[PDB]
Design an enzyme around this catalytic site. Structure first.
Site, PDB file in Angstrom:
ATOM      1  N   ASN A  21      19.626 -13.134   8.632  1.00 14.62           N
ATOM      2  CA  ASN A  21      20.818 -13.667   8.084  1.00 14.62           C
ATOM      3  C   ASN A  21      20.993 -13.095   6.402  1.00 14.62           C
ATOM      4  O   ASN A  21      20.152 -13.791   5.794  1.00 14.62           O
ATOM      5  CB  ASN A  21      20.958 -14.973   8.272  1.00 14.62           C
ATOM      6  CG  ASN A  21      22.362 -15.714   8.080  1.00 14.62           C
ATOM      7  OD1 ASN A  21      23.004 -15.108   7.094  1.00 14.62           O
ATOM      8  ND2 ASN A  21      22.814 -16.648   8.521  1.00 14.62           N
ATOM      9  N   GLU A  71      11.336 -12.741   5.859  1.00 17.97           N
ATOM     10  CA  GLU A  71      11.802 -11.702   5.141  1.00 17.97           C
ATOM     11  C   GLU A  71      10.719 -11.081   4.393  1.00 17.97           C
ATOM     12  O   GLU A  71       9.845 -11.950   3.732  1.00 17.97           O
ATOM     13  CB  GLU A  71      12.963 -12.035   4.189  1.00 17.97           C
ATOM     14  CG  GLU A  71      14.269 -12.496   4.735  1.00 17.97           C
ATOM     15  CD  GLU A  71      14.283 -14.206   4.967  1.00 17.97           C
ATOM     16  OE1 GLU A  71      13.147 -14.805   4.474  1.00 17.97           O
ATOM     17  OE2 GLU A  71      14.949 -14.703   5.579  1.00 17.97           O
ATOM     18  N   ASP A 110      22.195  14.297   7.704  1.00 22.93           N
ATOM     19  CA  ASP A 110      22.571  13.043   7.213  1.00 22.93           C
ATOM     20  C   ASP A 110      21.346  12.388   7.636  1.00 22.93           C
ATOM     21  O   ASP A 110      21.313  11.311   8.224  1.00 22.93           O
ATOM     22  CB  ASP A 110      23.778  12.234   7.640  1.00 22.93           C
ATOM     23  CG  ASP A 110      24.304  11.338   6.738  1.00 22.93           C
ATOM     24  OD1 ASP A 110      23.605  10.902   5.766  1.00 22.93           O
ATOM     25  OD2 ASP A 110      25.281  10.683   7.180  1.00 22.93           O
ATOM     26  N   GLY A 158      28.467  -0.154   6.231  1.00 23.11           N
ATOM     27  CA  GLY A 158      27.551  -0.871   6.221  1.00 23.11           C
ATOM     28  C   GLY A 158      26.472  -0.843   7.126  1.00 23.11           C
ATOM     29  O   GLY A 158      25.304  -1.444   6.826  1.00 23.11           O
ATOM     30  N   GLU A 189      14.638  -9.279   8.126  1.00 22.57           N
ATOM     31  CA  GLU A 189      15.944  -9.835   8.040  1.00 22.57           C
ATOM     32  C   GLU A 189      16.645  -9.975   8.951  1.00 22.57           C
ATOM     33  O   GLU A 189      16.839  -9.345  10.024  1.00 22.57           O
ATOM     34  CB  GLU A 189      16.573  -9.016   6.779  1.00 22.57           C
ATOM     35  CG  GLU A 189      17.949  -9.621   6.151  1.00 22.57           C
ATOM     36  CD  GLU A 189      17.549 -11.066   5.696  1.00 22.57           C
ATOM     37  OE1 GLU A 189      17.596 -11.119   4.234  1.00 22.57           O
ATOM     38  OE2 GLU A 189      17.201 -11.993   6.251  1.00 22.57           O
ATOM     39  N   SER A 231      25.910   2.282   8.039  1.00 16.88           N
ATOM     40  CA  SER A 231      25.220   3.585   8.039  1.00 16.88           C
ATOM     41  C   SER A 231      23.564   3.290   7.897  1.00 16.88           C
ATOM     42  O   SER A 231      23.309   2.663   7.057  1.00 16.88           O
ATOM     43  CB  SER A 231      25.813   4.250   6.894  1.00 16.88           C
ATOM     44  OG  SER A 231      27.249   4.509   6.979  1.00 16.88           O
ATOM     45  N   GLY A 232      23.112   4.420   8.099  1.00 17.16           N
ATOM     46  CA  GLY A 232      21.743   4.599   8.070  1.00 17.16           C
ATOM     47  C   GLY A 232      20.681   3.816   8.904  1.00 17.16           C
ATOM     48  O   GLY A 232      19.477   4.346   9.033  1.00 17.16           O
ATOM     49  N   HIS A 243      23.310   9.860   3.147  1.00 14.40           N
ATOM     50  CA  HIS A 243      24.662   9.475   2.152  1.00 14.40           C
ATOM     51  C   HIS A 243      24.448   8.190   1.713  1.00 14.40           C
ATOM     52  O   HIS A 243      24.947   7.535   0.809  1.00 14.40           O
ATOM     53  CB  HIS A 243      25.875   9.662   3.188  1.00 14.40           C
ATOM     54  CG  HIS A 243      26.342   8.296   4.038  1.00 14.40           C
ATOM     55  ND1 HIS A 243      26.114   8.553   5.242  1.00 14.40           N
ATOM     56  CD2 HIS A 243      26.708   7.258   3.650  1.00 14.40           C
ATOM     57  CE1 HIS A 243      26.517   7.386   5.954  1.00 14.40           C
ATOM     58  NE2 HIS A 243      26.893   6.358   4.743  1.00 14.40           N
ATOM     59  N   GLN A 246      21.296 -16.445   4.201  1.00 19.16           N
ATOM     60  CA  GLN A 246      20.472 -17.631   4.384  1.00 19.16           C
ATOM     61  C   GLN A 246      19.108 -17.292   4.672  1.00 19.16           C
ATOM     62  O   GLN A 246      18.932 -16.602   5.995  1.00 19.16           O
ATOM     63  CB  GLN A 246      21.060 -18.577   5.668  1.00 19.16           C
ATOM     64  CG  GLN A 246      20.138 -19.852   5.717  1.00 19.16           C
ATOM     65  CD  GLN A 246      20.824 -20.824   6.514  1.00 19.16           C
ATOM     66  OE1 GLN A 246      22.158 -21.024   6.663  1.00 19.16           O
ATOM     67  NE2 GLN A 246      20.120 -21.384   7.486  1.00 19.16           N
TER      68      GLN A 246
END
Length: 240
Positions: free
Chosen positions: A61, A69, A93, A186, A59, A188-189, A45, A64
């Protein structure tokens, strides 16, 4: 994640941020799990919208930078063929993202460990959800990666009438539902990491919470059960 705590920066090195292009910027939308150096596992989704997506590994923050990253474009999206956007209760899903380049592994960037096919957790098994999702129902995304202890709720309980009833399937894992800690939009996944024989493995892909709110008693967070899709995952990667 509602009711969690900030994770250590090296605790969950398979956690990714799935982001979309928004103007001249990028916005976090979902989590995911790095499962090869060039493949991410997420929820179907999360990719229904025909957006330009990137993945951020290492990642911590979102607001910042700290130099750990790595940013990589999504080159190919393979959604489970039985997914239906308008029927999240039916399951399926799950989606795989092939990255444009292979990321570099380090203490902040590692592959997630998946369970063996068919593995089911006993009720109340110890797991953590992680993510940058909302920290309150109708709130805002976290800045720093959050974790929350979310022990599993087995199918027999989760599919009972006062829990999720027929909305939950055996191809899903439920966790939490105390009314205090949960996934939220947020997340999700992203992963549900469960401790088995001394090692964390990613048993869930965050799929849904209640329409009424994120942390709602007797509405545990619901995840796609990774171990229901091992053969599918391996077949997609081998073909692509």
């Amino acid at each position: 994640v509602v009711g969690g705590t900030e994770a250590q920066r090296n605790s969950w090195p398979s956690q990714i941020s799935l982001q979309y292009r928004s103007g001249s910027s990028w916005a976090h939308t979902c989590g995911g799990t790095l499962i090869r150096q060039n493949w991410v596992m997420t929820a179907a989704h999360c990719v229904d919208r025909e957006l330009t997506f990137r993945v951020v590994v290492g990642e911590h923050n979102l607001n910042q930078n700290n130099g750990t990253e790595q940013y990589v474009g999504v080159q190919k999206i393979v959604v489970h063929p039985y997914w239906n956007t308008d029927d999240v209760a039916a399951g399926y899903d799950i989606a795989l993202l092939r990255l444009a380049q292979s990321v570099t592994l380090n203490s902040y960037v590692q592959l997630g460990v998946l369970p063996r096919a068919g593995t089911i957790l006993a009720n109340n098994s110890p797991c953590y959800i992680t993510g940058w999702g909302l920290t309150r129902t109708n709130g805002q995304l976290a800045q720093t990666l959050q974790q929350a202890y979310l022990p599993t709720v087995d199918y027999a309980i989760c599919s009972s009438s006062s829990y999720w009833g027929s909305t939950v399937k055996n191809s899903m894992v439920c966790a939490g539902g105390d009314g205090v800690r949960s996934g939220c939009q947020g997340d999700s996944g992203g992963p549900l990491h469960c401790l088995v024989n001394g090692q964390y493995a990613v048993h869930g892909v965050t799929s849904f919470v209640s329409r009424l709110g994120c942390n709602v008693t007797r509405k545990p967070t619901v995840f796609t059960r990774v171990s229901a899709y091992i053969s599918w995952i391996n077949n997609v990667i081998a073909s692509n």
